[PDB]
């Protein structure tokens, strides 16, 4: 009965308790600090959010963020009737993917070499800065990239 | 002997043994979950796998996606003989590299102000959907970003 | 005193000591190696440097890089008395941000369809990939992505 903390501490040395062990799955809580190089192998798991957008004009936007930081956007729908200058008039861009200086993407216009961007600025408005598009609608695709922070 | 034990065990909480601790280098094996914040001050090293695809009409391709879910791409060579809307001629984007829903990268064409956008679809195809060009090829460059899952 | 050992080896397998746990902050040293999946549900902090260039000709360009691997590049200011090939004729980038191999990003010139591209390559240099640029500057966006190795 003397021995048992130590045949009960040898298990704990193996698994169980709350020792983190180099092999098994486990849980991990609490701010966790790593000074030298780590690596990863396998698969990586950061958080993830997405993020649907009727920026207004027809322009879709579907933004993806991962681990808070980056998040990739992907421009979608058809944009009509705006100024060279102009604030995009629909839905805007929610706190969780809002950028803290402005960002903008460039999107490209489908099947044409005319190109564009919009800035996503910090409030969550988007600034259009693409021609003087007329009220004939032109398609708008093309993949972005923002770090959030 | 019977403090022997002891010795062993004030031994493994220091090194050695299946404990991973504050110090030295060491493997962990296992679906390790982090709840908490955790932070890298080094450097940490998550998979990297690389392609090369000659997309056909005579764009290169090279994509480096690492763990498995973003991946940027880089635009090479020349395209020629394509309509705005055609899906491109050469070697489709491998298993590996497929997205899960259809991603536009938007390309630029070199010592011009014209642009082109093409898009990967989850089946590995490539439709291109810049404007309309001839048998006068013209070099294609540019970065693109997308979320592989 | 020899029942210590283990009221002590006790604590360790708790908290303290060299050992890594389950709970608490803690600090962590070391090549750490892992082989299975990872997951973080809280924040992954990866080392962040940030820099700015003025690459010439009126061309801003703020750098932004985490874990010395993928940067994230905004264009801003205006380019102007530049040919078709140039290599941009301001400030360099920095070592800590130069690409393996060139990498050619994406622009956007504000309030037009007219779009450009810049090649930084690893000696740092910035050729300038966009049509023959007058005297009269044009306003130049858009945020590139490239991985640093």
Do not use: C
Not at 106 to 125: E, L, M, Q, W, Y
Request: net charge neutral; aromatic share 8%; glycine share 12%.
């Amino acid at each position: 009965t003397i021995n048992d903390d130590l045949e009960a501490i040898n298990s704990e040395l193996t698994s169980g308790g709350n020792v983190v062990h180099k092999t098994g799955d486990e849980t991990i809580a609490g701010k966790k600090t790593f000074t030298g190089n780590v690596e990863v192998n396998g698969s990586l798991t950061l958080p993830v959010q997405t993020l649907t957008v009727e920026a207004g004009n027809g322009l879709q936007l579907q933004l993806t963020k991962k681990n808070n930081d980056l998040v990739i956007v992907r421009f979608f729908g058809s944009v009509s009737n705006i100024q060279k200058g102009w604030n995009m008039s629909g839905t805007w861009v929610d706190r969780p993917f809002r950028p803290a200086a402005v960002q903008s993407l460039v999107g490209h216009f489908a099947g044409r070499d005319t190109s564009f961007h919009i800035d996503i600025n910090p409030n969550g408005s988007i600034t259009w800065w693409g021609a003087n598009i007329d009220k004939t609608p032109i398609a708008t695709r093309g993949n972005g990239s923002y770090f959030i922070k």
